[PDB]
């Protein structure tokens, strides 16, 4: 496994190079079916890029195909949400789903139960904003989610890669001039947010399941496959 042989800088640049692009929503208020359709189409197209982003995560390709499927099936909504939260940092009070799709919590009331998920996402973006989260830190957190969120539903290799990313996070903070006490404090603060990102995913997974049997908007086959893996 070549992931463990990389340096901290070579881990950062590999994750930065593997970043998926920022996709656009379908061009042109919103109802329930219209907003859910725009979000469904966007999430479905983002999933294709995430799967290719996962292959470029150092150490992910070393896993068997079954383990790659298990990790993506459990973390896919977390990865979509943390990317949405990252894009929305420069837009306080708003969620940047796409450069042409910027929504506030009032627009989240068009869909049932969507305003609760919106407020949790907005709160996470404010937390990233108050902590001055850096893009190098963000790509490490997103890789941690991919490898960690499903590791206990199965493994020594995945934990070795997780320790590798932990070394990379600390290496970034020491590069920024933080003291040893500030390094493990910021490391703890960042990882505790992943507990809430997991919470938003479980709440978001239940909402997508309700949208399925409400049948407001038809879901894609890939989205249904990722959704059915949680029930």
């Amino acid at each position: 496994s070549l992931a463990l042989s990389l340096t901290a800088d070579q881990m950062v640049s590999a994750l930065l190079d593997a970043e998926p692009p920022i996709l656009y929503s379908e061009y042109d208020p919103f109802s329930e079916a219209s907003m859910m359709g725009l979000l469904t189409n966007l999430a479905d197209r983002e999933l294709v890029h995430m799967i290719n982003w996962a292959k470029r995560v150092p150490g992910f390709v070393d896993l068997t195909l079954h383990d790659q499927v298990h990790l993506l099936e459990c973390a896919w909504l977390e990865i979509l949400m943390i990317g949405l939260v990252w894009r929305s940092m420069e837009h306080p009070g708003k969620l940047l789903f796409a450069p042409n799709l910027l929504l506030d919590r009032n627009q989240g009331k068009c869909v049932e139960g969507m305003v609760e998920i919106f407020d949790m996402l907005l709160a996470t973006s404010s937390r990233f904003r108050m902590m001055n989260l850096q893009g190098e830190e963000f790509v490490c957190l997103k890789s941690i989610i991919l490898l960690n969120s499903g590791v206990y539903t199965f493994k020594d290799h995945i934990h070795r890669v997780l320790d590798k990313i932990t070394d990379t996070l600390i290496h970034l903070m020491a590069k920024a001039g933080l003291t040893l006490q500030q390094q493990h404090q910021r490391l703890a603060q960042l990882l505790l947010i992943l507990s809430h990102i997991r919470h938003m995913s479980n709440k978001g997974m239940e909402h997508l399941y309700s949208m399925k049997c409400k049948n407001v908007v038809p879901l894609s086959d890939l989205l249904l496959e990722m959704l059915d893996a949680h029930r």
Partner: peptide, 9 residues
Amino acid sequence: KILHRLLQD
């Protein structure tokens, strides 16, 4: 399983 196919490529 679409997730399988997208990972093989």
